[PDB]
Amino acid sequence: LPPNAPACMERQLEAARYRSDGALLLGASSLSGRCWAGSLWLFKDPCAAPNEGFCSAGVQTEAGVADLTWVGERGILVASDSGAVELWELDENETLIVSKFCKYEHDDIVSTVSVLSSGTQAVSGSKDICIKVWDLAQQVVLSSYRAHAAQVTCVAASPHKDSVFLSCSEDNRILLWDTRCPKPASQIGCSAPGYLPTSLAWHPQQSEVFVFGDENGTVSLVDTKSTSCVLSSAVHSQCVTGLVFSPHSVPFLASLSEDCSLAVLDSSLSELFRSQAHRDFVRDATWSPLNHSLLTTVGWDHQVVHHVVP
Amino acid sequence: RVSSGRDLNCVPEIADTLGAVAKQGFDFLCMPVFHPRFKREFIQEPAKNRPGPQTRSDLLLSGRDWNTLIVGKLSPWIRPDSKVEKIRRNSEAAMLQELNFGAYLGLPAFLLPLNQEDNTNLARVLTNHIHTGHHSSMFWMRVPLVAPEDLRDDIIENAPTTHTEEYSGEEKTWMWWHNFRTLCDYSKRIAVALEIGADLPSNHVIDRWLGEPIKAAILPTSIFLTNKKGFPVLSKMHQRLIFRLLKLEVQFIITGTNHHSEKEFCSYLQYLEYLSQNRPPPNAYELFAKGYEDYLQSPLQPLMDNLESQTYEVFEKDPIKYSQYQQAIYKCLLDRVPEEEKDTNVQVLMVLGAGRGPLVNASLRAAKQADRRIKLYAVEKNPNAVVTLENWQFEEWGSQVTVVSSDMREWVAPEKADIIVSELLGSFADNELSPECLDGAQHFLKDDGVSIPGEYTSFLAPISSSKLYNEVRACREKDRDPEAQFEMPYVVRLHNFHQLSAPQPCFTFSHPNRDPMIDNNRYCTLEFPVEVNTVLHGFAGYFETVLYQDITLSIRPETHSPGMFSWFPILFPIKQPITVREGQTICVRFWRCSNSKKVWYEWAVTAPVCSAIHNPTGRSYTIGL
Ligand SMILES: CSC[C@H]1O[C@@H](n2cnc3c(N)ncnc32)[C@H](O)[C@@H]1O
Numbered sequence A: 001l002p003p004n005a006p007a008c009m010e011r012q013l014e015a016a017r018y019r020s021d022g023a024l025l026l027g028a029s030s031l032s033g034r035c036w037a038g039s040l041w042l043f044k045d046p047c048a049a050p051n052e053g054f055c056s057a058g059v060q061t062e063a064g065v066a067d068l069t070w071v072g073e074r075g076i077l078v079a080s081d082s083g084a085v086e087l088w089e090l091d092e093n094e095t096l097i098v099s100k101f102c103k104y105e106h107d108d109i110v111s112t113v114s115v116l117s118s119g120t121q122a123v124s125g126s127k128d129i130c131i132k133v134w135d136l137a138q139q140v141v142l143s144s145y146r147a148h149a150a151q152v153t154c155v156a157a158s159p160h161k162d163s164v165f166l167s168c169s170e171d172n173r174i175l176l177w178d179t180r181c182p183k184p185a186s187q188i189g190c191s192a193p194g195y196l197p198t199s200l201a202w203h204p205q206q207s208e209v210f211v212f213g214d215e216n217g218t219v220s221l222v223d224t225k226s227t228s229c230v231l232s233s234a235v236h237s238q239c240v241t242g243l244v245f246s247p248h249s250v251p252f253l254a255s256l257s258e259d260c261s262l263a264v265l266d267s268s269l270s271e272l273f274r275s276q277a278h279r280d281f282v283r284d285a286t287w288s289p290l291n292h293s294l295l296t297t298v299g300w301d302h303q304v305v306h307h308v309v310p
Numbered sequence B: 001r002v003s004s005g006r007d008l009n010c011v012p013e014i015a016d017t018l019g020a021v022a023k024q025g026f027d028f029l030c031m032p033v034f035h036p037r038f039k040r041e042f043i044q045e046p047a048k049n050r051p052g053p054q055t056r057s058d059l060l061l062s063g064r065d066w067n068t069l070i071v072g073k074l075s076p077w078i079r080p081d082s083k084v085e086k087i088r089r090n091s092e093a094a095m096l097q098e099l100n101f102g103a104y105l106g107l108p109a110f111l112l113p114l115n116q117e118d119n120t121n122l123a124r125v126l127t128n129h130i131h132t133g134h135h136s137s138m139f140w141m142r143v144p145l146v147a148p149e150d151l152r153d154d155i156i157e158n159a160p161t162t163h164t165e166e167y168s169g170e171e172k173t174w175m176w177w178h179n180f181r182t183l184c185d186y187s188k189r190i191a192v193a194l195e196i197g198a199d200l201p202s203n204h205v206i207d208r209w210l211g212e213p214i215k216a217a218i219l220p221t222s223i224f225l226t227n228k229k230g231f232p233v234l235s236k237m238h239q240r241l242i243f244r245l246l247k248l249e250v251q252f253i254i255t256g257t258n259h260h261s262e263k264e265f266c267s268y269l270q271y272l273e274y275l276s277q278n279r280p281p282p283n284a285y286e287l288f289a290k291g292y293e294d295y296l297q298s299p300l301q302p303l304m305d306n307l308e309s310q311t312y313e314v315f316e317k318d319p320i321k322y323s324q325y326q327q328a329i330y331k332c333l334l335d336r337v338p339e340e341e342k343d344t345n346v347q348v349l350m351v352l353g354a355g356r357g358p359l360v361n362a363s364l365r366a367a368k369q370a371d372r373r374i375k376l377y378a379v380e381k382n383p384n385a386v387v388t389l390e391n392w393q394f395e396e397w398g399s400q401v402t403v404v405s406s407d408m409r410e411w412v413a414p415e416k417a418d419i420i421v422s423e424l425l426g427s428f429a430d431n432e433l434s435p436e437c438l439d440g441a442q443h444f445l446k447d448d449g450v451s452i453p454g455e456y457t458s459f460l461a462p463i464s465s466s467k468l469y470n471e472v473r474a475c476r477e478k479d480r481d482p483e484a485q486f487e488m489p490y491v492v493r494l495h496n497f498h499q500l501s502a503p504q505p506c507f508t509f510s511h512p513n514r515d516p517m518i519d520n521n522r523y524c525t526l527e528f529p530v531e532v533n534t535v536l537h538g539f540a541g542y543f544e545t546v547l548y549q550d551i552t553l554s555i556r557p558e559t560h561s562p563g564m565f566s567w568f569p570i571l572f573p574i575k576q577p578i579t580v581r582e583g584q585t586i587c588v589r590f591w592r593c594s595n596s597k598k599v600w601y602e603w604a605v606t607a608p609v610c611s612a613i614h615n616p617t618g619r620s621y622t623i624g625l
Helices: B014-023 B063-069 B085-105 B120-130 B169-183 B203-207 B236-247 B266-277 B284-288 B309-316 B319-336 B358-370 B383-400 B434-444 B466-473
Strands: A012-018 A024-029 A038-043 A057-061 A065-071 A075-080 A084-090 A097-104 A110-115 A121-126 A131-135 A140-145 A152-157 A164-169 A174-178 A185-188 A197-202 A209-214 A218-223 A228-234 A240-245 A253-257 A262-265 A271-275 A282-287 A294-299 A304-308 B004-007 B028-032 B070-073 B109-113 B138-144 B190-195 B214-220 B251-255 B346-352 B373-379 B401-404 B417-422 B445-452 B455-464 B504-510 B522-529 B534-548 B551-554 B570-580 B585-594 B598-607
Touching (some): A012 A065, A075 A110, A084 A110, A209 A240, A209 A253, A262 A294, B028 B063, B070 B085, B085 B120, B120 B169, B138 B214, B169 B203, B214 B236, B309 B383, B319 B417, B319 B534, B358 B373, B358 B383, B358 B417, B417 B434, B455 B522, B455 B570, B466 B534
Parallel strands (some): A012 A282, A110 A152, B070 B109, B138 B190, B190 B214, B214 B251, B417 B445
Antiparallel strands (some): A012 A024, A024 A038, A038 A057, A075 A084, A084 A097, A121 A131, A131 A140, A164 A174, A253 A262, A294 A304, B455 B504, B534 B551, B534 B570
16 A cells, blocks of 8 residues: 555546556545545556555545546646545655645536646536636636536537637537637537537547537537537437547547446447446546557446457 | 525535534535435446445434534435436435435425426425425525526627516526425425525516515625625625515525635625624614514404403503594694683593503593693493503592493493594404494584594505415314415514505595494405516505594504504405516405494405405404494
């Protein structure tokens, strides 16, 4: 067990993010029992996770972790139950994880965070209905947007455009943001109102195409250009919680749902692979940078599963 | 001063959190009873078999703390009106689970959101909880003044915000509340936690909430300004709304993080205490009327019943009121006896309904003031009060005062009267049968005699109060008509209500009444122009009386006699609330009806819609003759 590392990891695994070198960022909350808090873990050996005694580094958070993102190779940006966006920094030796900043800007749970392509800026979304843009170096809020009319489910920064990001809300709006526009937000999606949007992922190559998941288990492919719903599949029997693209030239799409299932789809949104491995909600998926055939999922069942995709 | 709670959606340790909020000066904590992010599955394998515990232990606080310090919150993922069947089924199950846990804990209150227009299934589930065992705990419906869709920043290029004004649209949040509470059939356990925003709406939107059952006001840290010294403060407009809510004695809830991080969260609370301590102090009336707010009482019938000693005591505890009576008699004596005839001319003054003698004393102080001469008859049918009178006359008044133990309609007077004086008026003037009593007595008034009072007039005004509607409704009793409550008047210090139109005169009586044929029956049609959207629940009643010339008494607010805490208004309820749209007229009809045995009122609303005639043939309510 490393120094400053908790003896026990909270049961509810919220996030799993591979770094470039193939080390594994883990986020967990305690969602029941006496104490409702969270932890951040680094596993330089991913096969050891989630066992705390084989972790490279661990720390305890004041509160649960709703969302997580790597900031470069040593930075961890945290969406907390506390309404705080937290910046955590890895050690020189990467032996311990130390809090850079903890800012209480959101008036309710911080549900979602994404680092903008700049790498010096992030967007947070909250149950307080607000979306905030952060200056990470100065540790401040540049802008706060009350665009939506209900809790913000997801924010996803454009891969390569530092001023562009997507947001989706229970107000049933998908918003495309450009901070360079005086009215920075633009409402997008299929014409007809559909089921509530629950998850967003930009295509890693095509700058104007993204996928969204819905509360009804439908995954949909959208071109901002056409601003029309090109392709939809009914992949899940429950809400689509996460959408992750493979690092492949022509990327595979990992689909995760409260139906406790993982799905892998082609670019035609057809189903290549499905895993019923988890026996509770599947929270995250991260493809290995090392072996692109490898997909790691975490769930509230506290399973760290390593998938081999055909 | 101010009862205030902290609202949190994050509670790492319940012990520490509770300790912290107490140290800050908060009376109570609103918090989740389950983890807000802990979505639970009730139907689908395998998540259905998720190992517990499903939440933290009841052992973590004392029963006293759970009972007094904690308001529960519905988890935000729970959407019983979702259009997705699976989400609806899971949300129905989760809602019951959370409400059942609250009742398990003995929580004094539980917060539920109205954050959209359709809460039909939410109402159905809550109604089911309420009808599953009889309990006391309150449900606080968290409703915004301004819907979040109407609060959003105008930053969507292709979805601009409509800055065009829509009267009824700006009141949509009230309709969300109305529909919910109508579906839940006006449960007394369902109240409003009104959530206030940075941008207050038009006054009409705020006025919509006037007689509604508001238990809490939620103040986000967001709406507070920063003073020069960096303390949180509020705009004057927010302040004036706070003063309105302090009159309704609501509980204030602070929600959101510390946006004044140069100061502790007690700074928010201290500002509220600052406002409460600096509220424009009340009036003596408001001090008199302190415990009686919206308390329903039976109108006194001092003809049919013999009033108790302490009742006369309160009648007597109004020195301003008898100063008026003294003044009227003073004036009347001087008009009736020129200074040349002062010592030769002794006027016969008869007090009809003398109770324990306050009018006798006023009559005597008047005659010394006028320096004129008076013989007094003190007539009183209540033999209990005659004891008080006869001790008074033996010890103090002497033979100047003849106490008569008799009904003024039966009494054979040894001589005719110059001036009859009476105190026979209820909150609706003629509702204690002053007209019949004085009509009965007028044969023994000299042809040129004066009655004090000479005239009285009843006034009515349509009111909105969902609270008083519910209080009336709660007055169902065994062994009578299950709707009789609605067909009778109540004396009440009207507090949580909205007057929908200026008061209009209803019935008028004059004394003496020289009508060759006298008829005390009445039929009156009133038209109340209404300039608001609202719901009619009943009619406030008031009166004015002319003692003599310009000396009057009034509980009509526009003309209220100052200091006269003597007399709360009366309320005529209706069985079914009536929607009134801005610009519409309320038409009400009132009848004063009689036999040899009884007098009663009947009433009906005929516009914009018709009610049933209330109290037909006095079947629910009569005044004994
Ligand atoms: C001082 S409140 C009015 C008083 O008038 C008395 N009263 C009411 N009606 C009559 C009546 N018809 N004859 C005599 N006293 C009356 C009541 O008993 C009460 O004390």
